[PDB]
Design a protein around this ligand. Structure first.
Ligand SMILES: Cc1cc(NC(=O)C(=O)N2C[C@@H](C)N(C(=O)C(C)C)C[C@@H]2c2ccc(F)cc2)cnc1N
Ligand SMILES: Cc1cc(NC(=O)C(=O)N2C[C@@H](C)N(C(=O)C(C)C)C[C@@H]2c2ccc(F)cc2)cnc1N
Ligand SMILES: Cc1cc(NC(=O)C(=O)N2C[C@@H](C)N(C(=O)C(C)C)C[C@@H]2c2ccc(F)cc2)cnc1N
Ligand SMILES: CSC[C@H]1O[C@@H](n2cnc3c(N)ncnc32)[C@H](O)[C@@H]1O
Ligand SMILES: CSC[C@H]1O[C@@H](n2cnc3c(N)ncnc32)[C@H](O)[C@@H]1O
Ligand SMILES: [Cl-]
Ligand SMILES: [Cl-]
Ligand SMILES: [Cl-]
Ligand SMILES: [Cl-]
Ligand SMILES: [Cl-]
Ligand SMILES: [Cl-]
Ligand SMILES: [Cl-]
Ligand SMILES: [Cl-]
Ligand SMILES: [Cl-]
Ligand SMILES: [Cl-]
Ligand SMILES: [Cl-]
Ligand SMILES: [Cl-]
Ligand SMILES: [Cl-]
Lengths: 625, 303, 625
């Protein structure tokens, strides 16, 4: 079901109008708190001394109704950026008055339009109002997807509409928002109410709004077509846009009068419900990660910290990953033991980082499937999970599985392993120090031993998301650097964002590492071609891994393993957003640094403009060894 | 199914071995009682004379004559079990929940009709084993009661020791039945008690620091002391010899056999876990059987 | 209904035990996570290498059950403050192990006992565990109300129990907590599980726990008596204590075995439910302020800020206050107009700070009741409420009420008032600048005019509450003084606190103020006799006011107006708590300072020890003029 509201500029009685819009099926009402034609004077007499009351009484609705069902609208005659000084000051006063009355009513949202390029004084007044009393109220900026000047009919004889393609001009309205949002210093209480016209612009104009805080989408009744039976419908392009907005879970606002007058007015709304109840059903991954969309979390460090039971539970309920692991172990067992040696050859298999033992059961199933005999070591440094491992071993496994409660880099193995199997990969492949752990464990692997995974590679892609940037900015804490939140990665289900370039490989690690001079430090320079006008806010990070031969795992979007739940992507933010024009190249640098105690990442954008080197010396983020 | 943690071992007049065990880890935290008329077959379940699983783990047991088994339970219960006429079954005679915490120690008085029990609920109770009722309940200590020990030949006298650093001599014929002994200064917490079999006024006690001390109730002075073990002394068992030996058990996983001067004569490190109980054979006074949480039943010969 | 739990030290099977305690009616289970007699070695071989598993598996319960129904218990053999070094280190290791396993299970609370005076190493280990990974888990300190040494039977012949009164000794267990809580630096994750014995101590020993964070009360089955029918009951003193604990809304924990064996075990619990379902029903005030108990809020400043509609709504739904105002106006109208002048004399009545106009209707009702004619001015500077006032005036009042949208200190009145009626009192009487407002409005009052209220007086009382102190301490914000939260008052429904002395008057103001040299600055020194051992954390503030003659309002506890909702008490904190012994005097100083722009308070304790002067120059808290 959709969350919808009704926009009106004419309310005779507030109670009857609210009852009517509730009967029609709307969840809220956008209405003026003062009469739209009731222009008021604040400076010059005698109109300054106009007898009250100045608007409706607040006793006409309950406080709950004001808090939940009413969205305020700025009066259309208030022009805080007028070229006339009188009108400028009077509109400043009137805007302050209406905003203060909206806050007095406790309205959940207030609408303010952006109709021109210059809204600087409007931004000044709104920013002053925001920094006056702590409030949770929202301000929806009504911004048209296409400016009315670029939308008018070509009927002015001596002023024809331009037929020439203007790539950046067609995006001008976004600038209208971007400047305003920038003037108000990225206030979290300011969002976008995107208004959609009858004629849709190019796809890049629409994509310029990816990653923007869109809370509402405004649909006029005039943009609706009519079918054979007279019901209002939408074109297929408008349906694509409605689906894209439904994925963002915005609130739809029907504006205008009933033009399909033979049918009731709820028909419009019903169509949306239709379009919502026939939207593509999400996969298992989207259902699993629904409530975690754009939710910032600190990356887990299973080496330095002991994971909780429910984290292991989340890791275990992922059948695709363990099916892949079992298939890899099956292929490796068939490769190492010929058929005539299936009774004589017992493979030594060591699970390094067994947790609660899903890889152990996967190895047992692979041995049963390959008709080969194995001897299992389950190594785990977390003793709380060793409890579960040893209960499993006493109750089910038996002497076939030897549980080793120690660090794989310190364990003195009684024998060497034919196969080592690990699950130490993070969202950025090596960000949980799997290379160092598998290096410390390399000495008790046979000269021809196999490591599963055998290889892994991280991937980076520049993204645009003012929402995620504002969340990271809000992650400011006391007793630390006021910008330390920008110099650390976040595990996050990326939702409202825009990928600016195709992902490219970053760091690659292989196991076993026969190289005599093992060095896990890395320095990589990536050049991302960008073909749109956008604002860089950070870099999304994924990984691929070859467990054995053609058995792979991946959260990289192009090659993502269908139905895998164990990994969300990672996000590396940057302190200052960077404007990127169409055709420019984003050149970024990434370091993997370390000492004997900790490993960390450093990154910096070098083109089209230079940023500061983020997380120098691991001051803001380190991974304990 | 028998559990790993062997808790207690007692010989009978005819040379049979009574074992009490508990499961202190795993899914089920229960316990079991066993009787082996072949002591060398212990602790193998398939070669036992009798055996029963009980509700909760056992913390201490003792014989009641030749047929009764008195059990202190984790459930806070004192349980009397009885053997079948042919001594093939172990049936429950009574199970009374009078303590509010784990019953940690129990001892049968000299008459054989009454008993004394101590628990972590700081209380010490006297039981009439025939009427299955508590005769009296005393709250004399201020912490968990660690051990109680009935006097060998006086039915109204018994020792107790708790984590409140008190060693109380009890004579129930007095209006205030308890009397405090203890060494001069606040010594380390008393953990094990044992009356002397030949001298009714002398006992020994082992503390948490590994020290075993010989005390006389009359002169109430530490007659002798010896740093026998490196960890807490959990048990003290005298031998049935005329001039008896002293078997000391500790959480250092070692058994020590000392003389009347607390001088070390024999030492065994055969156990790889805590040493819980030890018992001397009535048929062969030189044979000493020890049990421990390593599920081992060791039979030492002592010169 | 009560929230109750079952305490057990013997759990054969966790599932069957949990099902049984759920059938009995308990909401949670306190149980050991390791077997209580399963002492473990961490240093010395061979017991150090004991084969696992070390405890039960976490797969035996769902994560929801671990999160909601299981409270962990520390094993009784863990003695981190033992005189033996081996036992000390081993118990440190075991306590860390058990706490980490409890955090691994996600338990909502973990029990740790306080059985002796010295718990310093226990506090060290617990504080180290708290500062290791962000967690919401709670730690309940099982503290006996009476120490077992002071509770034993007098049966040791050569060690008799002391019969001499020891006032501070009988409180020793509180010190056990107070030191521990102090060593852990007032961690909010550490609370009290108060255990109650069969014999209750003196009332001061029980009152020493007022204001302490008591989350649980432990009842042994042995303390229950038995009635005629065999059901377990409690003595009247225990019933008083149970009622006092129910007012604090703690969780009750039944421990021990079933001693009334003829009846089922739920009987015990049922009795509590009985005692709960026959507890004294709360008044209208307690029902109104239930969810706001000990909830810190910043004081309203209706002069500097414009109040919202629902704040006025809260102010209006208070019939006792407006009945008192109407009675005062009625008496004043009868006093000023004789019977023979009831038709000729029209009293001028001005409501200064009318809000949405409840005082206006009260004045109209008083005029109708007194059979006297009045002329009403409704003065309000908040224009949002002026909207409601003018809608009222156009729809109901008429020309009898003249609405004046201006500040009462700047308004040029067309005539002088016979009566001025105001409602500008805060929780601390003058903390909303009613004196200055009524002084600025004094010029348009007649030479014999009357002000309602005619007088008001603030009251202070020293209180003890570690809970409120910890809340204030938690009110630390970035970009300001790390201790500014201690130098500002809070409006709060005081609940879990202890009044240390009788309230005394602080500042008094009268209106009209004929004094030629008007000075609203104040300096007061208060000496509060204290007859208990306690810890001073702040001062509660109330007010009384004489509206007219014998018509008064009051939130002072001794003279509180029954059923009045408009005011909660106020709280002035202090930075450092102050120990106060029995018989000592708390000498405190209070200032009311001002300049031409703002008014503020300053306070300091001078006896029995000196504190810092709080809020100097209004750096942390000011009231705008
Ligand atoms: C095998 C393996 C897997 C991972 N996977 C991740 O870290 C990761 O992407 N997560 C996001 C998500 C999938 N998840 C959740 O629990 C969902 C329900 C929210 C788990 C985890 C996470 C949980 C809480 C956090 F605070 C941070 C991350 C890491 N290491 C290893 N070895
Ligand atoms: C409280 C306690 C005591 C012991 N001690 C023993 O089990 C023990 O060794 N004995 C007692 C008994 C088994 N026994 C008998 O002959 C019975 C059948 C008549 C032989 C022997 C003995 C020793 C000295 C004597 F003076 C007489 C007998 C162990 N653990 C604990 N907790
Ligand atoms: C006439 C008058 C009355 C007051 N009364 C107070 O200030 C006061 O005690 N309150 C506590 C409480 C009674 N209340 C509430 O709304 C309850 C439901 C929570 C209102 C108010 C308050 C509300 C929010 C806050 F953040 C702070 C205070 C002040 N001035 C004047 N003139
Ligand atoms: C399945 S999540 C990764 C698992 O490997 C374990 N692990 C990580 N590093 C090591 C290590 N060096 N030695 C042993 N186990 C490890 C973690 O504790 C976790 O259970
Ligand atoms: C009934 S809460 C106090 C009321 O008095 C109003 N008030 C406070 N100070 C003044 C003032 N100086 N002039 C007019 N109204 C005032 C406030 O705006 C509020 O409505
Ligand atoms: Cl309202
Ligand atoms: Cl608003
Ligand atoms: Cl809304
Ligand atoms: Cl599992
Ligand atoms: Cl553990
Ligand atoms: Cl490098
Ligand atoms: Cl002693
Ligand atoms: Cl779980
Ligand atoms: Cl916990
Ligand atoms: Cl709880
Ligand atoms: Cl009203
Ligand atoms: Cl207004
Ligand atoms: Cl003064």
């Amino acid at each position: 079901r959709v969350s919808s509201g009704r926009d009106l500029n004419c309310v005779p009685e507030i109670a009857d109008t609210l009852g009517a819009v509730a009967k029609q099926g709307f969840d809220f009402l956008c209405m003026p708190v003062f009469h739209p034609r009731f222009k008021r004077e604040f400076i010059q007499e005698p109109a300054k001394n106009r007898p009250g009351p100045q608007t409706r009484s607040d006793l006409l609705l309950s406080g709950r109704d004001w808090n939940t069902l009413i969205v305020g609208k700025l009066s259309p005659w208030i022009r805080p950026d007028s070229k006339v000084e009188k009108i400028r000051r009077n509109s400043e006063a009137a805007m302050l008055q209406e905003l203060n009355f909206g806050a007095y009513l406790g309205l959940p949202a207030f609408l303010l339009p952006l109709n021109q390029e210059d809204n600087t004084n409007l931004a000044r007044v709104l920013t002053n109002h925001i920094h006056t009393g702590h409030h949770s109220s929202m301000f929806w900026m009504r911004v048209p997807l296409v400016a009315p000047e670029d939308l008018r009919d070509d009927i002015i004889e001596n002023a024809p509409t331009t037929h020439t393609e203007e790539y950046s001009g067609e995006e001008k309205t976004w600038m209208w928002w971007h400047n305003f949002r920038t003037l108000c210093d990225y206030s979290k209480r300011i969002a976008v109410a995107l208004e959609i016209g009858a004629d849709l612009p190019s796809n890049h104009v629409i994509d310029r709004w990816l990653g923007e805080p869109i809370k509402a989408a405004i649909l006029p009744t005039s943009i609706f077509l009519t079918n054979k039976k007279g019901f209002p419908v939408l074109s297929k392009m408008h349906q694509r846009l409605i689906f894209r907005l439904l994925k963002l879970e915005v609130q739809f606002i029907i504006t205008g009068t009933n033009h399909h007058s033979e049918k009731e007015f709820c028909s419009y709304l019903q169509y949306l419900e239709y379009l919502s109840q026939n939207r593509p059903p999400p996969n298992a991954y989207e259902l699993f990660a629904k409530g975690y969309e754009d939710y910032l979390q600190s990356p887990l460090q299973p080496l330095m910290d002991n994971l909780e039971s429910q984290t292991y539970e989340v890791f275990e309920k992922d059948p695709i990953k363990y099916s892949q692991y079992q298939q890899a172990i099956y292929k490796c067992l068939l490769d190492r033991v010929p058929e005539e040696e299936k009774d004589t050859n017992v493979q030594v298999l060591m699970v390094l980082g067994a947790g609660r033992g899903p890889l152990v059961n996967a190895s047992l199933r692979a041995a049963k499937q390959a008709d080969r005999r194995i001897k299992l070591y389950a190594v785990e440094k977390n003793p709380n999970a060793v409890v579960t491992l040893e209960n499993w071993q006493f109750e089910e496994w038996g002497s076939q599985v030897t549980v080793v409660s120690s660090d794989m880099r310190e364990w003195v193995a009684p024998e060497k392993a034919d196969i080592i199997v690990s699950e130490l990969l993070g969202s950025f492949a090596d960000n949980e120090l799997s290379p160092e752990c598998l290096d410390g464990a390399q000495h008790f692997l046979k000269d021809d031993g196999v490591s599963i995974p055998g290889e892994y590679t991280s991937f980076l892609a520049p993204i645009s998301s003012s929402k995620l940037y504002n969340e990271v900015r809000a992650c400011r804490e006391k007793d630390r650097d006021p910008e330390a939140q920008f110099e650390m990665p976040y595990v996050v289900r990326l939702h409202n964002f825009h990928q600016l370039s195709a992902p490219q490989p970053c760091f690659t690690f292989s196991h076993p590492n026969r190289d005599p001079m093992i060095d896990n430090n890395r320095y990589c320079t990536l050049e991302f071609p960008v073909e749109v006008n956008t604002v860089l806010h950070g870099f999304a990070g994924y990984f691929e891994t070859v467990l054995y031969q053609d058995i792979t795992l991946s959260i990289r979007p192009e090659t993502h393993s269908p139905g895998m739940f164990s990994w969300f992507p990672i996000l590396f933010p940057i302190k200052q957003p960077i404007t990127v024009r169409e055709g420019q190249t984003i050149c970024v640098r990434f370091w993997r640094c370390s000492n004997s105690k900790k490993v960390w990442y450093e990154w910096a954008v070098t083109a089209p403009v230079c940023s500061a080197i983020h997380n120098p010396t691991g001051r803001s983020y380190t991974i304990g060894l | 199914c028998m559990e790993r943690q062997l808790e207690a071992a007692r010989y009978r007049s005819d040379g049979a071995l009574l074992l009490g065990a508990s499961s202190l880890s795993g899914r089920c935290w229960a316990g079991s009682l066993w009787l082996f008329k072949d002591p060398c077959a212990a602790p193998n379940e398939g070669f036992c004379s009798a055996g029963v699983q009980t509700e909760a783990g056992v913390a201490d047991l003792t014989w009641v004559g030749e047929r009764g088994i008195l059990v202190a339970s984790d459930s806070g219960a004192v349980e009397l079990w009885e053997l079948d006429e042919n001594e093939t079954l172990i049936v429950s005679k009574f199970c009374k929940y009078e303590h509010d915490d784990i019953v940690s120690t129990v001892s049968v008085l000299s008459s054989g009709t009454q008993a004394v029990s101590g628990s972590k609920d700081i209380c010490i109770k006297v039981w009439d084993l025939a009427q299955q009722v508590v005769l009296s309940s005393y709250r004399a200590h201020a912490a968990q009661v660690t051990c109680v020990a009935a006097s060998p030949h006086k039915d109204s006298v018994f020792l107790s020791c708790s984590e409140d650093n008190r060693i109380l001599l009890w004579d129930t014929r007095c209006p205030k039945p308890a009397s405090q002994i203890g060494c001069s200064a606040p010594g380390y917490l008393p953990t094990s008690l044992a009356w002397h079999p030949q001298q009714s006024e002398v006992f020994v006690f082992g503390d948490e620091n590994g020290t075993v001390s010989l005390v006389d109730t009359k002169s109430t002075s530490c007659v002798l002391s010896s740093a026998v073990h490196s960890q807490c002394v959990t048990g003290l068992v005298f031998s049935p010899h005329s001039v008896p030996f002293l078997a000391s058990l500790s959480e250092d996983c070692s058994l020590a056999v000392l003389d009347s001067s607390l001088s070390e004569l024999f030492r065994s490190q055969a156990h790889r876990d805590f040493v819980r109980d030890a018992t001397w054979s009535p048929l062969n006074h030189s044979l000493l059987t020890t049990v421990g949480w390593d599920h081992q039943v060791v039979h030492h010969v002592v010169p």
